[PDB]
Design a protein around this ligand. Structure first.
Ligand SMILES: Cn1c(=O)c2c(ncn2C)n(C)c1=O
Ligand SMILES: Cn1c(=O)c2c(ncn2C)n(C)c1=O
Ligand code: NA
Ligand code: NA
Ligand code: NA
Ligand code: NA
Ligand code: NA
Ligand code: NA
Lengths: 129, 129
């Protein structure tokens, strides 16, 4: 599923991501924009053989099981394919664990490089939330 | 689809029903509870041969086409089957026309008999909206 901007903001709020760990909804929408362009089915293989999955490009090295990342963990206790669903529940629940792991949203390199410090409220501007 | 209470409140808000024609979200959720028990696929045949469709039990006599209600109109310009979808957009758009037709939410007899004048805010109590 390719979400619209306000549609994704609303789904994230529905699943309790807004202001989670102190990160406003615009931060999460910005991260999703630059990680996946709002496409739930986005995947990207990393040089080390792990893969990033879904709307927030959650990585198989630590967070989900894909059966093809030797030595990796599965800290969200889910198959990585669950992160590609039209329903964002699994991605949100896992993102909550990631953002709680110590470095906040810096775990998302694209958030650090493209969202951090910017006018992230623009990402929810105009949305009925 | 059978919605949860807060899940439906959120979907209705997403589609601009909250405070539409002055009717708060709890009024709409209450109406859906007693019209369909939150089931998008609900149908009910009336004695006159028309049928009520969907989460808000919208009637084929005036609002949608089902091909089997002689003399009826289709003022929402949709097949009645569109009112049974998991996505509530068509039901919301049509409900906006119904509630604007002169009698407000009294068009929903179950709203008049079971929601009107009651503590309708209870229907959205606790919801992250
Ligand atoms: C070294 N290391 C990590 O780097 C790590 C982790 N979980 C997430 N990360 C990112 N665990 C459990 C870990 O041992
Ligand atoms: C008599 N009548 C109605 O009763 C009516 C209507 N549209 C909705 N209703 C309920 N129209 C167009 C109408 O002519
Ligand atoms: Na939407
Ligand atoms: Na939590
Ligand atoms: Na990580
Ligand atoms: Na929900
Ligand atoms: Na309108
Ligand atoms: Na009517």
């Amino acid at each position: 599923k390719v979400f619209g901007r306000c549609e994704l903001a609303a789904a994230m709020k529905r699943h309790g991501l807004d202001n989670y760990r102190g990160y406003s909804l615009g931060n999460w929408v910005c991260a999703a924009k630059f990680e996946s362009n709002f496409n739930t089915q986005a995947t990207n293989r990393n040089t080390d053989g792990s893969t990033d999955y879904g709307i927030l490009q959650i990585n198989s090295r630590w967070w989900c099981n894909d059966g093809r990342t030797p030595g990796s963990r599965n800290l969200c206790n889910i198959p990585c394919s669950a992160l590609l669903s039209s329903d964002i529940t699994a991605s949100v629940n896992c993102a909550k664990k990631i953002v709680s792991d110590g470095n906040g949203m810096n775990a998302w390199v694209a958030w650090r490089n493209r969202c951090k410090g910017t006018d992230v409220q623009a990402w929810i501007r105009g949305c009925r939330l």
